[PDB]
Design a protein around this ligand. Structure first.
Ligand SMILES: [Mg+2]
Ligand SMILES: [Mg+2]
Ligand SMILES: [Mg+2]
Ligand SMILES: [Mg+2]
Ligand SMILES: [Mg+2]
Ligand SMILES: [Mg+2]
Ligand SMILES: [Mg+2]
Ligand SMILES: [Mg+2]
Ligand SMILES: [Mg+2]
Ligand SMILES: [Mg+2]
Ligand SMILES: [Mg+2]
Ligand SMILES: [Mg+2]
Ligand SMILES: [Mg+2]
Lengths: 91, 97, 197, 97, 127, 25, 214
RNA sequence: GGUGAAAUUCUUGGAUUUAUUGAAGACUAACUACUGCGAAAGCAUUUGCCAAGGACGUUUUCAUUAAUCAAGAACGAAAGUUAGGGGAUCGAAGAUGAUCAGAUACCGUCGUAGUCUUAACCAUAAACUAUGCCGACUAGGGAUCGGGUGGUGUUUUUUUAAUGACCCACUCGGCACCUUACGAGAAAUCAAAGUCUUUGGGUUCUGGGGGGAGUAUGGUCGCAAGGCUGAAACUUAAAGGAAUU
């Protein structure tokens, strides 16, 4: 059964710290504890060890990432920016 | 184009999936074409390429990972390499891709 | 410990002696274990590679940037921070960059930087929610927490100390020419109040 | 009641066109509703053409033209006698002069 | 035969500029405005103020070496009227009347593409 | 008074009523 | 009273060899002295002059040519090509309603290391004995025309160095090249480069500048 | 500078004006139309990639799989809200100069939020064609957009002259328009608002004199602003629509 209506994982905090703070933590803890696709072995086995460290349970691969996500939006822009600059130089 | 030719050989031909069966088929000379996923490890890719050079068999590079390759052969488990033992009514061998 | 950014242990070969050298890098976003890092003037423009500032195009995103060639990384080292190359000066070789604070700096083209952004970004977007999590954050850094307000102290303890109401009493903006023991508050402030615009 | 079948503008099939600003007062106007007049003047005048003709090098060179498209809101056009309010039957006429 | 300057008449509303430069535009010769000739503050843009301003420009254009001008007419431009003011025609005519030869009269009103927001608001200047 | 200023006066009045009902609760 | 006009040198301005008569006009500057000399204040001047002035023919009354000075040789200024642009009224006459406007611009580098953006403008034309009153293109002709124009502008540059490109633009050879390559797609009536602007520059190259001044 | 006229403001420390070169963010002029696309809201610089869609063509397939729809759902201008970025311009607030009897308005000069974007909210507009959707029929014309068909047509009039572009005649679909009033309407007007006392093709939603009132209360959604739902007491002989003088 749906045990909580809206707090979700932040139900451990009870009634403390304010609803707005608990929603902000809810967004980033769902991201923090989610399993992600491995870009190497293709499985859904990538979990966060520590902030910025994302390790696949199989294939032993560890990738440097964001604090609470594997990849941040500014990082994907950088990767596309660096790819575009490298392609133009090698053109 | 490629995904329909892969679909037709699965429904009408002979094949095997996985690394240990592809290497065994290459070693026995029974393979006509092997398809390798994009996210296949380069050590495995260079080793499957090297057996196929000895076997003198064509290698197709699947644009898509093992998840897309497994889906493209009608399966719902990840498939890293597919070897075509013999095509059925598919023209995957005759077509240049 | 004490650093939000993850550290990449990158191992090179010593050119002049048969042995392996271990180098402690600040891991860039997308750098993985088993990745081949390339460092040098002729290195290719890829994330994690170390290149001199003169050998990258306009708009390149770099981190661990050297202020001077050979100081082994000074700029854009904290998690999620980066430096943008905004111009080149070929004669008297100097690269104009944009710092994470928005400052326009001119650096020699021989200074090196690592392509990409420092990993672990977005850390400050999560509230610590409680004193205990700030306690463990500063347990590994230094003894700067918790912080007693100066107005909560007696006059012998702080320039804002004392009074029958907790108040500062004189302007909290303190001149740059003040001396130690006076520089409590907003030192050499150009403006005060909430920033608008 | 309704005054015009084309309600006040030229917009049947759009729902929204774009706003343009009036030249005289800078009121936001839907581009189709705006009264539009083309402004074609000589670069100088009608009386100073001869004055420039014998006081310039390059005899009878071009006498260039000044080009401008003027966008008026309804009130500015009426106040400047550009559209000149008409009768109920004569306002159905769409001819320029 | 003729020494050529650039006339550069800025004819906006509320004023009129007659700014003769050198052929490259960097060096200024006799910038005389309409507010330098009449002191009434509502006829600075008037044709009379512009004609006096233009003939004072031609008074200094002679005795420096300038005998002919390339005329560049300027309205305000940008997000503004794009229409030359009442004094541009008087200033241009007075330059011809003063003996300075003319050549390649051109309109150089700065014309944007669609651009930043013109001032006035949604309902405009309503008086 | 056009309907929208009557509407604006009523909206401001309504959140005076639910503000004084906030104290009473 | 100061009268700063009794203390300037009154230089002279030339034109590159890729033109007709090269006497453009004088230039009032300063007497060059010590203590912040006024000799290098003549190195960066930019002069806009009409092509009909530089050719003697009124067929180029538009296409004003932009000249930048490079070196000061005695009491004489040597210039070089800095850009081309049409007169404002020339654009306004060509732009008319009930016809399509097509524009194409590509950045491209010459054989000399000159980076420059080459514009182009084209307008659809009504055929002879045509009845319909507008003659718009169909937005695939426009893309096909714009791709052809971008190819011709790119192809004529990357050879034909800045001096040769200038000699390529004075007789409007590009306009005939575009017209012949586009008349198989849609008829056009006012095909013009309309603008040349300089983006980057190579080293000074005094030998190439002296080749343009005899 | 600005204005109707001024004042505020800047200005010999050089304002305004001129030239060269940068930076930033917006926006995409003219072409631009009784033209196009989208379910609507909306959508106009180039190129590349991605998925989608209408119409047309079809001697292709399936064979009733359909129409409209309580509950339920996606999107939904602007303003507004949260958290970052960015913040040139204009600019609710505010400040200031004028006008004026006053002017906390219009006019003038600054100027925060906002205006842009990312990730979420909101769910409202004269969100309009104030005109629900599907289907059939009833009158004439020309123009225009997209597709198609046919000219022993023009352009490439160069020995019997590609493909596009154009011209002519049809056709399907679409945005519209003009004429007339068969017919309708209270009229304005309307090819639908026609095929209605000669009243029935199918189906959804809504209204029952004007106010009180989209108010109070309750419920539900929303962070909030607010949204959806939604009275009664009381009060009144008109309120209102179109046209005539
Ligand atoms: Mg404290
Ligand atoms: Mg105490
Ligand atoms: Mg005490
Ligand atoms: Mg003390
Ligand atoms: Mg009325
Ligand atoms: Mg609308
Ligand atoms: Mg269109
Ligand atoms: Mg445009
Ligand atoms: Mg419903
Ligand atoms: Mg509504
Ligand atoms: Mg309605
Ligand atoms: Mg349509
Ligand atoms: Mg009622």
């Amino acid at each position: 059964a749906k045990r909580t209506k809206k707090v979700g994982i932040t139900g451990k905090y009870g009634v403390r710290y304010g609803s707005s703070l608990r929603r902000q933590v809810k967004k980033l803890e769902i991201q923090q504890h989610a399993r992600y696709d491995c870009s190497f072995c293709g499985k859904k086995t990538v979990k966060r060890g520590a902030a910025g460290i994302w390790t696949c349970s199989c294939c032993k691969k560890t990738v440097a990432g964001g604090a609470y996500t594997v990849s941040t939006a500014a990082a994907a822009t950088v990767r596309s920016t660096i790819r575009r600059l490298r392609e133009m130089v090698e053109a | 184009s490629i995904n329909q030719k892969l679909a037709l050989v699965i429904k009408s031909g002979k094949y095997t999936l996985g690394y240990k069966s592809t290497v065994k088929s290459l070693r026995q000379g029974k393979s006509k074409l092997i398809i390798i996923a994009a996210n296949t490890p380069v050590l495995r890719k260079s080793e499957l390429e090297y057996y196929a050079m000895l076997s003198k068999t064509k290698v197709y590079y699947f644009q898509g990972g093992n998840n897309e390759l497994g889906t493209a052969v009608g399966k719902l488990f990840r498939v890293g390499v597919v070897s075509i033992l013999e095509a059925g009514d598919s023209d995957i061998l005759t077509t240049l891709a | 410990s004490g650093r939000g950014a993850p550290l990449a242990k990158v191992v090179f070969r010593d050119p002049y002696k048969y042995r392996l050298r271990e180098e402690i890098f600040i891991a860039n976003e997308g750098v993985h274990t088993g990745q081949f890092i390339y460092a040098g003037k002729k290195a290719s423009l890829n994330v994690g590679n170390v290149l001199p500032l003169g050998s990258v195009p306009e708009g390149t995103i770099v981190s661990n940037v050297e202020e001077k060639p050979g100081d082994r990384g000074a700029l854009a080292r904290a998690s999620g921070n980066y430096v943008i190359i905004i111009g080149h000066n070929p004669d008297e070789n100097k690269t104009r960059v944009r710092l994470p604070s928005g400052a326009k700096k001119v650096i020699s083209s021989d200074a090196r930087g690592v392509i990409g952004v420092i990993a672990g970004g977005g850390r400050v977007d999560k509230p610590l929610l409680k004193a205990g999590r700030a306690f463990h954050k500063y347990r590994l850094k230094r003894n700067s927490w918790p912080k007693t307000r100066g107005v909560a102290m007696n006059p012998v303890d702080h320039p804002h100390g004392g009074g029958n109401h907790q108040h500062i009493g004189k302007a909290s903006t303190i001149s740059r020419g003040a001396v130690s023991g006076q520089k409590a508050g907003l030192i050499a402030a150009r403006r005060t109040g909430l920033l608008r615009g | 009641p309704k005054k015009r079948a084309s309600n006040g503008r030229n917009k049947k099939g759009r729902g929204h066109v774009k706003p343009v600003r009036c030249v005289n007062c800078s009121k936001s106007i839907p581009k189709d509703k705006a009264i539009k007049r083309m402004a074609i003047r000589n670069i100088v005048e009608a009386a100073a053409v001869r004055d420039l003709s014998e006081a310039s090098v390059y005899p009878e060179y071009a006498l260039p033209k000044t080009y401008n498209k003027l966008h008026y809101c309804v009130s500015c056009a009426i106040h400047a006698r550009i559209v000149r309010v008409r009768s109920r039957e004569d306002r159905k006429n769409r001819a320029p002069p | 035969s003729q020494v050529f300057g650039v006339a550069r008449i800025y004819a906006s509303f509320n004023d009129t500029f007659v700014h003769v430069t050198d052929l490259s535009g960097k060096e200024t010769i006799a910038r005389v405005t309409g507010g330098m000739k009449v002191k009434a503050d509502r006829d600075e843009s008037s044709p009379y103020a512009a004609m006096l301003a233009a003939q004072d420009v031609a008074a200094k254009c002679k005795e420096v070496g300038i005998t002919a001008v390339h005329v560049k007419i300027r309205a305000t431009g940008g997000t503004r009227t794009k229409t030359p003011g009442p004094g541009g025609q008087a200033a241009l005519r007075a330059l011809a009347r003063s003996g300075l030869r003319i050549g390649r009269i051109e309109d150089v009103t700065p014309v944007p593409s669609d651009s930043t927001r013109k001032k006035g608001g949604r309902r405009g200047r309503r008086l | 008074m056009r309907a929208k200023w009557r509407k604006k006066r009523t909206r401001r009045l309504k959140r005076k009523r639910r503000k004084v009902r906030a104290r009473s609760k | 009273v100061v009268d700063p006009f009794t203390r300037k040198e009154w230089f002279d301005i030339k034109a590159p060899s890729t033109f007709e008569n090269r006497n453009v006009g004088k230039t009032l500057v300063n007497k060059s002295t010590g203590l912040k000399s006024a000799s290098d204040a003549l190195k960066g001047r930019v002069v806009e002059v009409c092509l009909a002035d530089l050719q003697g023919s009124e067929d180029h009354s538009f296409r004003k040519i932009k000249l930048r000075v490079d070196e000061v040789q005695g009491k004489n200024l040597l210039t070089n090509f800095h850009g081309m642009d049409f007169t404002t009224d020339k654009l306004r006459s060509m732009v008319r309603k009930w016809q399509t406007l097509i524009e194409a611009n590509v950045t491209v580098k010459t054989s000399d290391d000159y980076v420059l953006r080459i514009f182009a403008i084209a307008f659809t034309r009504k055929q002879a004995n045509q009845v319909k009153r507008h003659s718009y293109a169909q937005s695939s002709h426009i893309r096909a025309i714009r791709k052809v124009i971008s190819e011709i502008l790119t192809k004529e540059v990357q050879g034909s160095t800045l001096a040769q490109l200038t000699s390529k633009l004075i007789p409007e050879v590009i306009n005939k090249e575009i017209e012949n390559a586009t008349k198989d797609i849609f008829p056009l009536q006012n095909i013009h480069v309309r603008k040349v602007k300089l983006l980057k520059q190579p080293k000074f190259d005094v030998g190439a500048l002296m080749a343009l001044h005899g």
